DNA sequence: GGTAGACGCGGACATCAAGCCCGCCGTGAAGGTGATGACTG
DNA sequence: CAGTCATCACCAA
């Protein structure tokens, strides 16, 4: 709920029908269940239900701003379109409420405990590595539209990154064993490469539909 | 009127980190190829000596670590077998304009602020400053354990203009005391020449070389480093000695210590010798606080009466105000 | 109220230096200004299992044939040479002063009640009966630590540095002087009332102590002998590593410095036994046993707390061992 | 400025005990929105 | 008497 940073109190009272009964979509349409508990006569009983339907209807007109984005995108066989894209607050919701649960939680961290007490029968937890955090707002984030019932500013974002952007230092100099014991190129990358080739050696071709393309491109 | 949310002064009085050698005594004026006192990393079989606690003291283990030894690994450095000199040489750079700050939100306290300091200078100027870190130079002070029963310290004082030299000085650092500030005409020279930086009328760069006698293969005391956020097994090194390549060496910020310790007027105990120049006169390692906030001598209360409602203190304590002018700090609230 | 500080530190008195090592013919003892270092020597060498032997993997075949094979070790020497038989040890020593006051403290009035416990020791009892055993430990060579025992002739000569050049000079016979007895005379006492000045903050005090040991020819010295830990090597490639400096066998200074404090005649077993080194709650670790606990309540920890907090002054033979103990140093605190 | 044609086997690699205490971890600035309130030309 | 400019409380795990 985007609007006004300091009228954003009365939207818990009018969100809370939401809680407790099922009586959200009573307020507005089906006033049977904001006649009888409501106690209001029909002038505030019509000003209830007609105020009510200014949250998801329509609250202005439908514009722009030179601060949005509005990128071009070439048509196949004539000009452009502009294309302004949105925060998906909505997706960004939910994704931050999946995330939650499976970096912390019961089963990720209890998954995690089993693992520390080197007994653990299998389930699943998951781990994110390497993200990284940015603030929407700053120290206050309520006039921005909620970000604020778990969110509190803090979308998680997923890592992206190149492989290959934390390299190491070459050095093959003339050495007594950086000559001629540097013939095999000793890496810190390859110990993934090399455990992979051995614990995946053990298996038999009793499930072996998938594990004979692997090898070629090893 | 306010002072600002926002003050950052500069430090003025800028030295670098001083790194260490070893020699002989009358090869002290060719001391330019001494080679450095290195770092030794050593194991140490010793003995449990601290207090025991009883809070889980079980006879089973307690009573029985005591009879058993106790294994540490430290850092040292010694002097050769063959030299008997420790040398020490860093550079000090003395700036000027020593009462401008280089970040402030308001303009009227900027200019309350300047005119203030320029009060302070256009009667008086930075001399009795000056000479104090002139004495704290001419002494052997920024060698702090090092020349702690030396039997004789020489400390040479270059002042440099390009690659030659423009005026060299020469003294003898154990005459000069700790607790006094006596001085005579060859101090003076130096005093004048720093407060000649301070008061932004020339570029002074000098080069300090300090020479101890001490004994052949004796220790000297590096700066210890502080390893701080460890979270480790046993104490894998319980002490590291701070070295840059192959020298061992002292922090920039000791020897910057050592020369701003010239605040004798303190309240409690100023005939018990010079402490540094704090805003609140702490002296840490010795646990307390002279210049409390309760005794009106703090740098939070005087700069606060001198700039803003013209109370101007005693001059004895506008040395310290604009001595913690010259060593800088955010002063904001 | 005055309750102890929770950070102490008193920096030692009597630094030593590594002492090193040479080699040469006795009778050539005041020539001995370049006499060649003692090196330290790899060898390989091929013992028998003289080891006991577990039995969790106990079989007729496994220990019979590892009892009947060899062993093989490696392992390092140090000798004195095919025609020297003096052993040559040579270290300097630094006396400070200003034994009683910490380098660093929290609690100020606990600092000026140490400082004045300390002061009221020292003016009604100098240093001297410190000093003077100090002095011994300087006078025969303990220092000398398994290089002394069996030797033939001993030989100390301790100068006084204040220049350049030596301006006092002593010769001992460590030999004559024992291990057992503080018996002083009239040579002994000015190298003790030069150490009690010294240590009292009356003058400067260095030393050059050089002492020469007859052994033999060719006979094995005894450098000191350093911890390679925290590892866990494989295959346990040297059983034994001696320290040295640069191509020269030698001394830890701790050591040396170990030795100059075996002081300790007032612990309450016994004194005719011998002295230990100052060290609180003190133990010989060599031994096993830890000499003044903290149960029978005369460990350092106890006699200094009841002596500066409380007023309880200890005996007077304790007072020595306290004020051993600040020259000494170490780190005090909480509980 | 001469090819020539070869480099050994076996066997073995130490055990013991121990790994410190104390104090502390900086401050300032990083909010949009209507809604009168004061100004108002 | 009507636009407009600085300030003002309104919220907020």
Redesign the pocket.
């Known amino acids: 709920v985007v609007?006004?940073?300091?009228a954003?109190?009365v939207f818990?009272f009018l969100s809370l029908q939401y809680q407790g009964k099922n009586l959200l979509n009573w307020l507005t349409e089906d006033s049977a269940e904001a006649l009888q508990a409501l106690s209001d006569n029909a002038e505030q009983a019509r000003e209830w239900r007609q105020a009510f339907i200014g949250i998801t209807t329509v609250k202005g007109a439908p514009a722009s701003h030179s601060l949005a984005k509005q990128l071009y995108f070439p048509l196949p066989g004539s000009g452009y379109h502009l294309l302004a894209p949105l925060f998906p607050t909505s997706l960004v919701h939910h994704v931050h409420a999946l995330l939650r649960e499976a970096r912390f939680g019961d089963a990720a961290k209890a998954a995690r405990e089993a693992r520390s007490r080197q007994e653990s029968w299998p389930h699943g937890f998951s781990e994110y590595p390497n993200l990284a955090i940015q603030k929407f707002?700053?120290?206050?984030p309520?006039?921005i539209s909620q970000l604020?019932?778990?969110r509190?500013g803090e979308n998680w974002l997923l890592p992206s990154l190149p492989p290959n952007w934390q390299r190491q230092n070459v050095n093959a100099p003339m050495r007594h064993s950086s000559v001629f014991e540097h013939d095999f190129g000793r890496t810190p990358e390859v110990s993934r490469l090399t455990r992979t080739l051995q614990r995946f050696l053990a298996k038999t071709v009793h499930n072996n539909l998938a594990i004979r393309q692997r090898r070629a491109q090893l | 009127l306010s002072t600002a949310?926002?003050?950052?002064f500069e430090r003025k009085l800028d030295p670098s980190d001083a790194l260490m050698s070893a020699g002989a005594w009358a090869q002290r004026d060719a001391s330019q190829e001494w080679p450095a006192v290195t770092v030794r990393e050593k194991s140490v079989?010793?003995t449990?000596?601290?207090?025991l606690?009883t809070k889980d003291r079980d006879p089973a283990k307690l009573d029985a670590?005591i009879q058993?030894?106790?294994?540490?690994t430290?850092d040292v450095a010694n002097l050769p077998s063959d030299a008997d000199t420790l040398k020490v040489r860093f550079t000090l750079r003395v700036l000027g304009g020593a009462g401008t700050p280089s970040?402030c939100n308001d303009a009227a306290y900027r200019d309350k602020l300047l005119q203030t300091v320029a009060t302070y200078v256009n009667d008086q100027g930075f001399a009795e400053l000056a000479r104090r870190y002139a004495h704290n130079l001419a002494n052997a002070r920024f060698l702090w354990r090092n020349r702690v029963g030396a039997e004789a310290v020489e400390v040479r004082i270059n002042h440099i203009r390009q690659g030659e030299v423009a005026r060299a000085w020469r003294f003898d650092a154990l005459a000069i005391g700790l607790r006094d500030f006596k001085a005579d005409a060859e101090l003076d020279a130096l005093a004048e020449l720093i407060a000649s930086g301070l008061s932004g009328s020339g570029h002074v760069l000098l080069e300090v070389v300090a020479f101890a006698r001490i004994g052949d293969g004796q220790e000297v005391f590096p700066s210890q480093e502080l390893i701080?956020?460890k979270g480790d097994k046993?104490?894998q090194k319980?002490?590291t000695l701070y070295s840059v390549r192959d020298a061992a060496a002292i922090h920039s910020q000791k020897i910057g210590n050592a020369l701003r310790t010239i605040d004798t007027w303190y309240p409690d105990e100023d005939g018990l010798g010079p402490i540094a120049v704090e805003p609140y006169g702490s002296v840490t390692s010795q646990g307390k606080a002279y210049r409390q906030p309760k005794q009106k001598l703090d740098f939070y209360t005087l700069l606060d009466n001198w700039v803003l409602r013209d109370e101007a203190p005693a001059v004895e304590q506008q040395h310290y105000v604009i001595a913690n002018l010259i060593r800088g700090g955010?002063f904001?609230?």
Do not use: F, M, W
């Not at chain 1, 609007?3 to 300091?6: R, T, V």
């Not at chain 2, 449990?48 to 207090?51: G, K, L, V, Y």
């Open positions: 609007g006004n940073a300091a954003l109190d818990k707002g700053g120290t206050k309520q006039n604020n019932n778990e509190r | 949310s926002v003050l950052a079989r010793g449990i000596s601290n207090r606690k670590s058993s030894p106790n294994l540490q430290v970040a701080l956020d046993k104490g319980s002490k955010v904001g609230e």
